Specification:
Blueprint lengths: L1 H10 L4 H15 L16 H6 L9 H14 L2 H6 L3 H10 L4
Protein name: Leucine-rich repeat serine/threonine-protein kinase 2
Organism: Homo sapiens (Human)
Family: Belongs to the protein kinase superfamily. TKL Ser/Thr protein kinase family.
């Protein structure tokens, strides 16, 4: 539950198994329970470095990561508020490093 969310934060605090942790995170993401992902630590701060460092050349994680990112921007209402005010530098990096 939420313990798995902070534990995934703790595992991802330190790429293949990272993709699996993010995958189970996406499995909780696509669920439609409640206002569950209201922590927004990842989604604003924890998701980003693995989104850029652990996806440098990657889309082993960059695919599922940016997918989870968009699903999270759709899910969490405060995700945009945590965004509106760097993700903008990050998305161009992911696009430029992946032309094909």
């Amino acid at each position: 539950d939420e313990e798995t969310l902070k534990k995934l934060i703790v595992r991802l605090n330190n790429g293949k198994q990272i993709e699996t942790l993010v995958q189970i995170l996406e499995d909780l993401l696509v669920f439609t329970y409640s206002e569950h992902a209201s922590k927004l630590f990842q989604g604003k701060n924890i998701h980003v470095p693995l989104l850029i460092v652990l996806d440098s050349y990657m889309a082993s994680v960059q695919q599922v990561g940016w997918s989870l990112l968009c699903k999270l921007i759709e899910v969490c209402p405060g995700t945009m508020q945590s965004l509106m005010g760097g993700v903008h530098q990050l998305i161009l990096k992911m696009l430029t490093v992946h032309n094909a």
